[PDB]
Amino acid sequence: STGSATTTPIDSLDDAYITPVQIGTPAQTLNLDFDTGSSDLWVFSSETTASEVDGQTIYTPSKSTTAKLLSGATWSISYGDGSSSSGDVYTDTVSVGGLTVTGQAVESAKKVSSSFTEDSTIDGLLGLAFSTLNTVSPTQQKTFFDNAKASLDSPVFTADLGYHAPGTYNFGFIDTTAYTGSITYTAVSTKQGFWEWTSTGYAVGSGTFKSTSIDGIADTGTTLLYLPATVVSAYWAQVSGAKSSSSVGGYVFPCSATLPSFTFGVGSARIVIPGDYIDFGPISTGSSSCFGGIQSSAGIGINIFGDVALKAAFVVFNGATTPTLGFASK
């Protein structure tokens, strides 16, 4: 089997991407944030505290003939921005782009934090990191991808995120029409539960390439590119007037700038992020200070190849017995 679904930016800055997902019988379609940095499939639901729902579509298990309470199971998760959610668990049929999993754990939110409530466009998350990170207790649950894997034509999924445009998540096949050149594969460590790999270095604009190992994670659920302070300082030094602002919470730059590109290495291959992808617009409405899309990872504890990086590539998440990651230009 295979599946193919379109993923769409939630706003004009590509702050996140949503993908329609069918849950239950008859289908209830929710727009979920596919997140290769976490491992829980959770939704806004008929159980979510009413004051914490503001415009989201909710899953109502009592209207699904295939829903079953997973008795005793609870979940609770926090993300890197300090947002969080928690609740109980149902099993139900879940389909993505034509690919169906029966008995998928669907984690129903009882509580969500404010930045979820405020994100009217995101109806929940669909985790695609390794199932060892799943938060369900006392019986950890499998991700949609793990449950689907044995049925897939090939044990892979791909992310093809757009810049200010829709893109695609495919399950079970590589669309050879979706990228240019060849795919370069690189080793993955699953020791921390992430799609963790080592970039071979970087360049700023038309500058020379610096060969240096940068360990980080491929994370579709993180908006920005978070890299070591040394790398990020070298980037922003090429933008007149750019500075790190502790009041704003990162590097800002004059909205009048033309940002340089940023290149990252994948083995001997190179992925170029255009300068436009690094612009996250005014820090507040009408400001002439703009927020940067490359930020320091210092104090996060991990480097994160988030959407800014991943959208510049066609990315293969290879879930074979020994997982790997592939990147192609597009």
Q: Least separation, in Å, of the C-beta of 99 and ligand 46P? A: 22
Query: Of 14, 35, 88, 307, which is the active-site residue?
Result: 35
List the interface residues with ligand 46P, window 211-230 (CB under 6 A). Answer: 221-222
Whole-angstrom Cα distance, residue 232 to residue 82? 23
Q: Does 35 bind ligand 46P (CB under 6 A)?
A: yes
Q: Does 257 bind ligand 46P (CB under 6 A)?
A: yes
Q: What is the per-residue burial (b if ≥16 Cβ within 10 Å, else e) of 50-82? A: eebbeebbbbebeebebbeebeebebbbebbee
Q: Does 121 bind ligand 46P (CB under 6 A)?
A: no
CB 171 within 8 A of CB 21: no
Q: Does 16 bind ligand 46P (CB under 6 A)?
A: yes
Q: Which of 107, 57, 55 is nearest to 84 (CA)?
A: 107
Q: In this chain, which of 109, 203, 259, 283 binds ligand 46P, going by CB under 6 A?
A: 259
Stretch touching ligand 46P by CB under 6 A, among 24-32, 78-86, 199-207, 310-318: 78-86
Q: Which of 188, 190, 185 is nearest to 313 (CA)?
A: 185
Here's the x/- map for ligand 46P, 260-299, by CB under 6 A: it reads as: ---------------xx--x--------------------
Classify residue 231 by burial, with Cβ atoms within 10 Å: 0-12, 13-18, 19+.
buried
Q: Does 239 bind ligand 46P (CB under 6 A)?
A: no
How many residues lie near ligand 46P (CB under 6 A)?
Answer: 22
Helix (H) or strand (E) holding 234: helix 229-236
Between residues 193 and 275, which has the closer beta carbon with respect to ligand 46P? 275
Q: Which of 120, 29, 35 is nearest to 310 (CA)?
A: 35
Between residues 197 and 226, which has the closer beta carbon with respect to ligand 46P? 226
CB 64 within 8 A of CB 250: no
Stretch touching ligand 46P by CB under 6 A, among 87-95, 101-109, 129-137, 252-260: 252-260
CB 305 within 8 A of CB 262: no
Helix (H) or strand (E) holding 147: helix 144-149
Largest CA distance in the chain: 60
Helix (H) or strand (E) holding 317: strand 314-318
Whole-angstrom Cα distance, residue 199 to residue 106? 34
Active site (annotated) includes residue 199: yes
Q: Least separation, in Å, of the C-beta of 19 and ligand 46P? A: 13
Here's the x/- map for ligand 46P, 136-155, by CB under 6 A: it reads as: --------------------
Q: In this chain, which of 4, 83, 140, 289 binds ligand 46P, going by CB under 6 A?
A: 83
Q: In the structure encoding, which two tokens stand for residue 13, read together?
A: 């800055």
Between residues 221 and 265, which has the closer beta carbon with respect to ligand 46P? 221
Q: Least separation, in Å, of the C-beta of 250 and ligand 46P? A: 14
Between residues 101 and 278, which has the closer beta carbon with respect to ligand 46P? 278
List the interface residues with ligand 46P, window 91-120 (CB under 6 A). Answer: 115-116, 119
Whole-angstrom Cα distance, residue 106 to residue 120? 20
Whole-angstrom Cα distance, residue 9 to residue 117? 18
Q: Which of 38, 59, 39 is nearest to 123 (CA)?
A: 59
Q: Least separation, in Å, of the C-beta of 112 and ligand 46P? A: 9
Between residues 2 and 295, which has the closer beta carbon with respect to ligand 46P? 295
- Active site residues per annotation: 35, 199
Footprint on this chain of ligand 46P (rule: CB under 6 A): 16, 33, 35, 37-38, 79-81, 83, 115-116, 119, 122, 125, 221-222, 257-259, 275-276, 279
